[PDB]
Amino acid sequence: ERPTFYRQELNKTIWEVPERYQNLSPVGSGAYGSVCAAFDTKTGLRVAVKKLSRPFQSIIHAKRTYRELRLLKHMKHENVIGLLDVFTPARSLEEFNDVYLVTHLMGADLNNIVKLTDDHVQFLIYQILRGLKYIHSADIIHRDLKPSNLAVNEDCELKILDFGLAVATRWYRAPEIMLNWMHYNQTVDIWSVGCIMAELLTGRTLFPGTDHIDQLKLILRLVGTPGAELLKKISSESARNYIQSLTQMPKMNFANVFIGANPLAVDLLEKMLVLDSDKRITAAQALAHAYFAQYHDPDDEPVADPYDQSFESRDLLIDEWKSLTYDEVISFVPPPL
Ligand SMILES: CN1c2c(-c3ccc(F)cc3)n[nH]c2-c2ccccc2S1(=O)=O
Ligand SMILES: CCCCCCCCO[C@@H]1O[C@H](CO)[C@@H](O)[C@H](O)[C@H]1O
């Protein structure tokens, strides 16, 4: 049956949680909720508890809430955030208005952790890529990988987050996103990883654009203007004509850009940071790159179970998304101790 709950007020709102969770302490807030650190008396683990804000205020919010819970319920991988628990104080669908998500407490994000040694870069990028192999295998694309969406502990264990605690986002974004391309490759994320890896190696933001146009300018300086091969695939006439009006520039030699870096790191960067998304290295191919030779184990880089995202194309009523979310809360099975 239902545990007993207790109420208290934190970050200008009421938190009602199971007694099992003790010593709540705010850690931060993001765009869709706020997070407290707590002690889970059942496991002796330190956990992060996220309370969603206004989860069912509109159709938009209600579907978002559902998307988040479905996503977090599916992730079962060491380098991806997963769900220890999900709960609501509501005893029925009728009173259901609040959702709390529980995961392992992590020490810091990669913002906060950044000068790294080459071995640390290796292990951190390895883990990112291992997590990405898993997410991508389910046909999920992150789309906003950046250092504040990557949580890390003092032993350098790393997890990909859906949303961190809120460094421009545009700095890590694939150029196709900024050109508002219709559809996206799973290697929009690889671009991001390339930007992150570069920054870990050099201690400097690779492409610190002031806006999307400045961003592309900085990108094209490094990687050069598109070639005839890439122009063949651009359906937008305005994009083509503009791209072809640019003063052409050749790709820079990355060994000179990343002076002193492990040449294996440099070689990997050159495979990530290609403008043509079809030519970027995949997360699965990257894991086998020699740069990760001390960590790569092909028998321990698993794929995910298929994930059904058909709900994304449905237009439902605010109470229907709420009821579907309530069902997900009710059917949650905790992971083993
Ligand atoms: C995992 N947590 C989290 C979460 C989070 C996300 C979803 C949940 F269900 C619970 C926490 N978002 N951001 C953080 C986070 C970011 C940087 C360092 C530490 C943390 S956290 O441990 O509070
Ligand atoms: C001026 C800089 C613009 C460079 C844009 C290059 C983006 C190229 O990547 C493109 O990604 C698409 C998936 O989104 C694919 O459908 C295309 O085949 C691929 O070439």
Curated annotation (Swiss-Prot):
Entry's EC annotation: 2.7.11.24
Catalytic activity: L-seryl-[protein] + ATP = O-phospho-L-seryl-[protein] + ADP + H(+); L-threonyl-[protein] + ATP = O-phospho-L-threonyl-[protein] + ADP + H(+)
EC category: transferase
Keywords associated with the record: Acetylation, Apoptosis, ATP-binding, Cytoplasm, Kinase, Nucleotide-binding, Nucleus, Phosphoprotein, Serine/threonine-protein kinase, Stress response, Transcription, Transcription regulation, Transferase, Ubl conjugation
Lineage: Eukaryota, Metazoa, Chordata, Craniata, Vertebrata
Organism: Homo sapiens
Primary localization: cytoplasm
CDD domains given in the database record: STKc_p38alpha (cd07877)
Expressed in which tissues: Brain, heart, placenta, pancreas and skeletal muscle. Expressed to a lesser extent in lung, liver and kidney.
Coiled coil: none
Name used for this protein in its record: Mitogen-activated protein kinase 14
